[PDB]
Design a protein around this nucleic acid. Structure first.
Ligand SMILES: [Mg+2]
Ligand SMILES: [Mg+2]
Ligand SMILES: [Mg+2]
Ligand SMILES: [Mg+2]
Ligand SMILES: [Mg+2]
Ligand SMILES: [Mg+2]
Ligand SMILES: [Mg+2]
Ligand SMILES: [Mg+2]
Ligand SMILES: [Mg+2]
Ligand SMILES: [Mg+2]
Ligand SMILES: [Mg+2]
Ligand SMILES: [Mg+2]
Ligand SMILES: [Mg+2]
Ligand SMILES: [Mg+2]
Ligand SMILES: [Mg+2]
Ligand SMILES: [Mg+2]
Ligand SMILES: [Mg+2]
Ligand SMILES: [Mg+2]
Ligand SMILES: [Mg+2]
Ligand SMILES: [Mg+2]
Ligand SMILES: [Mg+2]
Ligand SMILES: [Mg+2]
Ligand SMILES: [Mg+2]
Ligand SMILES: [Mg+2]
Ligand SMILES: [Mg+2]
Ligand SMILES: [Mg+2]
Ligand SMILES: [Mg+2]
Ligand SMILES: [Mg+2]
Ligand SMILES: [Mg+2]
Ligand SMILES: [Mg+2]
Ligand SMILES: [Mg+2]
Ligand SMILES: [Mg+2]
Ligand SMILES: [Mg+2]
Ligand SMILES: [Mg+2]
Ligand SMILES: [Mg+2]
Ligand SMILES: [Mg+2]
Ligand SMILES: [Mg+2]
Ligand SMILES: [Mg+2]
Ligand SMILES: [Mg+2]
Ligand SMILES: [Mg+2]
Ligand SMILES: [Mg+2]
Ligand SMILES: [Mg+2]
Ligand SMILES: [Mg+2]
Ligand SMILES: [Mg+2]
Ligand SMILES: [Mg+2]
Ligand SMILES: [Mg+2]
Ligand SMILES: [Mg+2]
Ligand SMILES: [Mg+2]
Ligand SMILES: [Mg+2]
Ligand SMILES: [Mg+2]
Ligand SMILES: [Mg+2]
Ligand SMILES: [Mg+2]
Ligand SMILES: [Mg+2]
Ligand SMILES: [Mg+2]
Lengths: 77, 46, 62, 102, 93
RNA sequence: UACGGUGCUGAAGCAACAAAUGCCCUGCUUCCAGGAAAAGCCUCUAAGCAUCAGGUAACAUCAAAUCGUACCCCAAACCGA
RNA sequence: CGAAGGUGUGCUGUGAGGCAUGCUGGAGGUAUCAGAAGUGCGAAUGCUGACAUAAGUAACGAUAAAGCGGGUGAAAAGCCCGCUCGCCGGAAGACCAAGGGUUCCUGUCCAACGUUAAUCGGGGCAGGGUGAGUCGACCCCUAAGGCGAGGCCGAAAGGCGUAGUCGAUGGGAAACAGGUUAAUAUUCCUGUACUUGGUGUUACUGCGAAGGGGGGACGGAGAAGGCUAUGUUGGCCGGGCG
RNA sequence: AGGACCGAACCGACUAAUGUUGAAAAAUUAGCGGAUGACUUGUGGCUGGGGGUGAAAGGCCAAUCAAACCGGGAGAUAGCU
RNA sequence: UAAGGUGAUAUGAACCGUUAUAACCGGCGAUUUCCGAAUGGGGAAACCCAGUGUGUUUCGACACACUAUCAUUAACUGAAUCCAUAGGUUAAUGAGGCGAACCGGGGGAACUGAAACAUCUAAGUACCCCGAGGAAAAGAAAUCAACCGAGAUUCCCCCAGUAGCGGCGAGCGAACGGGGAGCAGCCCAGAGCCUGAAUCAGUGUGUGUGUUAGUGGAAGCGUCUGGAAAGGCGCGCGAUACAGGGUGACAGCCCCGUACACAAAAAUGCACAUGCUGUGAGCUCGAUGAGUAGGGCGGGACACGUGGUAUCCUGUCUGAAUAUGGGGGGACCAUCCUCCAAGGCUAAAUACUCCUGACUGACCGAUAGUGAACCAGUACCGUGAGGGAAAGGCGAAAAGAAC
C-alpha cells in the first residue's frame, strides 16, 4: 500500500474545489519512493518505501535510530 | 420453448452453494443474514 | 448399579461390558424377530453399558 | 409435599358427589385424582377385534380436581385441611383440627 | 472388523421379506439389516463371530428411506443398509 | 398345472448372396486455416544402497474398500404454474 | 331468578341516539361525574376475507377411432380378460446421461387429486423392491478456468499472481454369454474368463528420481479396397394339407 | 476443390391461415431458408450494471433493459389526482 | 425432594419405585458422531483421500494420538558470498471465526430542501470497512478568563434559536458564564542516598454476603338457587398473608401461593481480612518530549462557506527558539495576564440490551398485537440475493356418541 514505513503517511482524502466551489472527492498521495539506505551499523543496504519527508527524517535521526523504531512497530524491512 | 431454468446440480452447487458463499466475505454475510432471519435452508445445498 | 461395579477392576469391567454388549445384541435379535415380550430390557441393558463405561473413564487414571 | 396421597380416604367438597367419601386410586399429573365410586361417567366403549373386544357402556371413575376433595378425618366425621410438620426427623401430615398426624 | 465391541453393533436385525426367504432357500443367502457404516468386511467377521457360521461373500446396498405423511407433516424414514450374506453351506438360526 | 404356470427330454442348428453412416481406419491420399495437456505406460541414468534392500519370471495365498444401481427420461415423473 | 353480543318488538327524544322487553345467547357488564383517545366510513381503479353475476353458459387440451362379448363391482363408453378395428414404427419402439427422487412392484382404499364416471391411476395408506474387483462414480492425470503458501500491489475491503492445489465435457487396469424375481441384475445363480495390487516361496539379478528421452498425442475433406453387424433366398429340421 | 448445387436429420423463421380469457405469456398447420460451415450442438468455464457483451437491432445480460434484480437511503419528493 | 413415575402430539405396550440409588430439581463431573473458523490435504457443507508415530493381530487388517495458516520468541540449521544475511526444519506461547445495540476510527452518497440549480442543504446522515470493551472514547491545561479569578475529562439543565455563519438565500448555529450529576489524580523521559515502606495486578486462605435447588407458611360452616356455588341469605374465623393464579358461575379461610420465617453437600460472584510472588515509593539534586512548533502551497475541521479570520488537523515544500525561552488571549502590533505542546496512563457520573429474573401498563386481544398466539422465517414464490403467507376457541369433565 502507498504508506511510508518511516512516517506512516498514507493517502488522505479531500476535495478538489473549482472557482464555483464545486466540490469533488480526491486523494492526496504522499511522495513515496523506494530508496536503498546504507546501514553502516550492519554493512548492508536496506530498502525502504519512504516519503521524501521520511527521507528527511532518516537524515536527521539516522537510519539506525529509525529502523529501531520500525522493528519496535513490526514493519518488516 | 426453452425456459430460463435449466437445472444443473454442479452449476447450482458452484454458483450458490455453501462453499461458494463461505469463499467470499459477502457470501459469509449472506449466511449471517439467513442465520439471523432463522432460515431453515441456509443455502441451496442438499 | 454403580456402587458395586466400583469394587471391580478395569478387567472385570471390560468383560462385563462385552457380556452386556452381547446381551444387547441377542436382545436386539430377539426384539426384531417378533420374540421379546419384555421390551424394557433394551433400555435396561443399554444403561448398564453406559454405567460400565462411565466407570472405566473414571478409572483410566483421571 | 402433597396433601392428598394415593390411598387416602377423602370426601368430595364440590360436585354431584358433594358429601360422598371415597378412597383415592390415582394422583394424576394435572392435579386431578380418581376416587373410588365418585365421578362415575357412563362411557360408550367401542369394540376392537383384538383385545378387550366387547363393545359396551362402561361406568368408570372419572377424574375430579384435587381442590374439590378433602381428607376425611374419621374421628370428627368431617372434612379437614392438611398441614406439614416435622416430627422426630421426618415430614408428616397432620389434621389442622386436633393437630393429629395422619 | 477385528474388535468384538465393533462386531456386536454391526448386525441390526434380520430382514424377513419374501425375497430374503427365497435367498435363504435357494441361494444360501441370509438378508440382514446392518449399520449404515458397516462395511463388507465387518459384516462378514460379525456373522462369522456371532452366528458361528461360515461366510463366503457379502453383498450390500443402502436402502433410501421413504418420505411419508403424518397428517400434514412430511417426514422421511432413515436410510438403512441391507446385507446379503452368502453362506458356504450351513444355517442354524 | 392354485390357470398365473411348472419339472424332464429335445429336432435341425448349414450354405450362398447382398450389405452399412459401423470395424480395419489414431490408417491411406490430399488440403491449409497447420490441428490439447498431463499421468498411467516403456526406457535411461543421478544422489544413493549392494553376498542387504530393491528388480524380472514362475508359483501359491490374500485383497480389490466405499458410494450409485429402483423407475420416468422427446416425457403425465425433467424445463415449461 | 341469565351479562356482553346477536335478532325482533314496543315506547321515546329536534338529531346523532336512548329506555324497556320477547327470543337466542351462556358470563361477564357497568350508572354518575370526570379523564384519555388506534372514536364513528359508502366511495380512495382503497386493503383482506367471504359471497354473487355472467351461467349451469364457454370449455373438458391435437379429427390416431373405435366396436362387441365376458368378468369384477353398489354402479362399467373409460378398469381386467378376450376377439376384431384403427394409429406410430429414424417412432408415438428400446437403452441411457442430465434433471427429478420412490413416481418402480404388490396388496388395499376412492373423500380430495384425475378437466367426466371410476371398481382404474404417476392419487391416499401399508408393505416390499436397487445386491459389482470388471458398469459408473470415488480414485491416478491433467484442459479451460478457479483457489492460491510466501510474494507483489492496494485507504480498509481486497486485487493480481509464483510454488503448489483444485478443476471434465478429455486421458488412464479388467467380464462375457445364458438362467432367474411381482419388482434388481455385464451386480444374484450356472458356466466360462480377465485385470491390478499386496504378502510369501523359489531361481536369477544391478536396482534405484520431484529429473532426461520416448510414448501417450490428437485437424479438415476425400477416396478405394477388405470386413462385420444385419438382412435376403436356398438347403436342412419340424409342423401343415386348409 | 468449394463460406459450391438439390435435399432429410439438425439449425433457423419469409408468407399465409388458425388461434388472440390460446393446447402455448410468441405456438400450431401448410408451405419457406440454410444444411462441410463465418455451421450446429452437449458439458464445464470467463466477462456484472453506466458495467458487460453486441457481424450494431439500443439488441441481449434468468418471460424484466435508453442502465438488470434484490435489499437498503425511504414514509425520496409529488405546487398533481 | 419424593409417592408416584418411563418428555410431547398420544393413546397403548413392557417396566421401575413407594422411607430411600424410581422419577423430578440443582451443583460439580463424564460422554459429547459428522459438518461448520474447521485447523492433516482436497471439496459440489455434512463427503473424498492421506501421512507420521506408537501400541495391537490369528497376519485379513485394527484402535488411539499427532500433522493447517499467520504472528511472536527460542533452538537447530543454512545460500548466491569469507563473515553474515535471506531462506529452511522443529518446539513453545498466542491469534483466527460468530455475535443485537452502544463505542472509536478509516472511507462516504443521493433523493430531497433551496418552491428551478451549481455554492449551500440533506449529512459526516445512510451505507461499506477496521478494531475494541464492558462500556468505549475523552481526560489532569502550552485550557478559559479579564487585571477579579476559575482550576482535568464526561453527561444533564440554562445561557439562546442569542452572538455569529449564510447564493446574508434556504437553512446552519455556538461559546463565555451560571446551576447540577460525579469527581482522583498519577508515571516515564535519571542519578544518588535510602530499599523494598504506597499502589492496583494476579494468585491462595479465613470470615461474612449473595446467586445457582428448596422448607414451613393462617383461618369456613349451614342453608337457597343451580348441571355445578366460590354467587344469594345467615352466622363465624385469620390477616406483617385481601399480591396473584386456579378450581363445574364471582373463594381472604378448597388448592397453588402471598406476607413472614428458615435453609446448601458442591460450585461460584461482589465485597473484607490475611499470606506467597512479583511492580515501586520517600528523600535529594538534576532533567522538561525537533523534521516538532511556526511558515508557504492545496485541502479539511472548528457554529464560522477565506471572509478582515484567529484556533486545531495535514497531503506537499520548508523549518525555529529551546525557561535569558516558547504557546495562547479570534486579522495584526505593543503591553499585561495566563498556561508550558511536540511522551504516556487513569475510576466514577454517560451510552446500549442479543440474553436472564421479577414487576408494571387509561398497550393489542386473532384483518389487532411480533411476519409468526397454531411445528413460521414454515408452506409457497424465486437461479440467487431475497421475498414471504394463511391458519386460534367442543365441553366443567371426553363423559368424543355403546347399540
Ligand atoms: Mg452459473
Ligand atoms: Mg459415422
Ligand atoms: Mg440396476
Ligand atoms: Mg434400470
Ligand atoms: Mg419416446
Ligand atoms: Mg368488554
Ligand atoms: Mg339479550
Ligand atoms: Mg365497509
Ligand atoms: Mg364520502
Ligand atoms: Mg350466454
Ligand atoms: Mg353456446
Ligand atoms: Mg360446447
Ligand atoms: Mg382429451
Ligand atoms: Mg365391454
Ligand atoms: Mg407417493
Ligand atoms: Mg405403476
Ligand atoms: Mg372425479
Ligand atoms: Mg361413486
Ligand atoms: Mg400410488
Ligand atoms: Mg488468484
Ligand atoms: Mg497470502
Ligand atoms: Mg488433481
Ligand atoms: Mg425393470
Ligand atoms: Mg513376488
Ligand atoms: Mg455376415
Ligand atoms: Mg381353401
Ligand atoms: Mg452450400
Ligand atoms: Mg443453397
Ligand atoms: Mg433435436
Ligand atoms: Mg410442431
Ligand atoms: Mg414450419
Ligand atoms: Mg439445401
Ligand atoms: Mg434507432
Ligand atoms: Mg429476457
Ligand atoms: Mg442494509
Ligand atoms: Mg411514498
Ligand atoms: Mg431521506
Ligand atoms: Mg479436515
Ligand atoms: Mg481444509
Ligand atoms: Mg444535490
Ligand atoms: Mg429543488
Ligand atoms: Mg454542499
Ligand atoms: Mg453545543
Ligand atoms: Mg411449601
Ligand atoms: Mg396455606
Ligand atoms: Mg375447588
Ligand atoms: Mg493550511
Ligand atoms: Mg499553535
Ligand atoms: Mg494569578
Ligand atoms: Mg514541553
Ligand atoms: Mg397477525
Ligand atoms: Mg373473531
Ligand atoms: Mg411481513
Ligand atoms: Mg400477518
Amino acid at each position: 500500500s502507498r504508506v511510508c514505513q518511516v512516517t506512516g503517511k498514507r493517502p488522505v482524502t479531500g476535495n478538489n474545489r473549482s472557482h464555483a466551489l464545486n466540490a469533488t472527492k480526491r486523494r492526496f498521495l504522499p511522495n513515496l519512493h523506494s530508496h536503498r539506505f546504507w546501514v553502516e551499523s550492519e554493512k548492508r543496504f536496506v530498502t525502504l518505501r519512504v516519503s521524501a519527508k521520511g527521507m528527511r527524517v532518516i537524515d536527521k535521526k539516522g537510519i539506525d535510530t529509525v529502523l529501531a523504531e520500525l522493528r519496535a512497530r513490526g514493519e518488516k524491512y | 420453448m426453452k425456459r430460463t431454468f435449466q437445472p444443473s446440480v454442479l452449476k447450482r452447487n458452484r454458483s450458490h452453494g455453501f462453499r461458494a458463499r463461505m469463499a467470499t466475505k459477502n457470501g459469509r454475510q449472506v449466511l449471517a443474514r439467513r442465520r439471523a432471519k432463522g432460515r431453515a435452508r441456509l443455502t441451496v445445498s442438499k | 448399579k454403580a456402587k458395586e461395579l466400583r469394587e471391580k477392576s478395569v478387567e472385570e469391567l471390560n468383560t462385563e461390558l462385552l457380556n452386556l454388549l452381547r446381551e444387547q445384541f441377542n436382545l436386539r435379535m430377539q426384539a426384531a424377530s417378533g420374540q421379546l415380550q419384555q421390551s424394557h430390557l433394551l433400555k435396561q441393558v443399554r444403561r448398564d453399558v453406559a454405567r460400565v463405561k462411565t466407570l472405566l473413564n473414571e478409572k483410566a487414571g483421571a | 409435599a402433597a396433601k392428598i396421597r394415593r390411598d387416602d380416604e377423602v370426601i368430595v367438597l364440590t360436585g354431584k358427589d358433594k358429601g360422598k367419601r371415597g378412597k383415592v386410586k390415582n394422583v394424576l399429573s394435572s392435579g386431578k385424582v380418581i376416587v373410588e365410586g365418585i365421578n362415575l361417567v357412563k362411557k360408550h366403549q367401542k369394540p376392537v377385534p383384538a383385545l378387550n373386544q366387547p363393545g359396551g357402556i362402561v361406568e368408570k371413575e372419572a377424574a375430579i380436581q384435587v381442590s374439590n376433595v378433602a381428607i376425611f378425618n374419621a374421628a370428627t366425621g368431617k372434612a379437614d385441611r392438611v398441614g406439614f410438620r416435622f416430627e422426630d426427623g421426618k415430614k408428616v401430615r397432620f389434621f389442622k383440627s386436633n393437630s393429629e398426624t395422619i | 472388523m477385528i474388535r468384538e465391541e465393533r462386531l456386536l453393533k454391526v448386525l441390526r436385525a434380520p430382514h424377513v421379506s419374501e425375497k430374503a426367504s427365497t435367498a435363504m432357500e435357494k441361494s444360501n443367502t441370509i438378508v440382514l439389516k446392518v449399520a449404515k457404516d458397516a462395511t463388507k468386511a465387518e459384516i462378514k467377521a460379525a456373522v462369522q463371530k456371532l452366528f458361528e457360521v461360515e461366510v463366503e461373500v457379502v453383498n450390500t446396498l443402502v436402502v433410501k428411506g421413504k418420505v411419508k405423511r403424518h397428517g400434514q407433516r412430511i417426514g422421511r424414514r432413515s436410510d438403512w443398509k441391507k446385507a446379503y450374506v452368502t453362506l458356504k453351506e450351513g444355517q442354524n438360526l
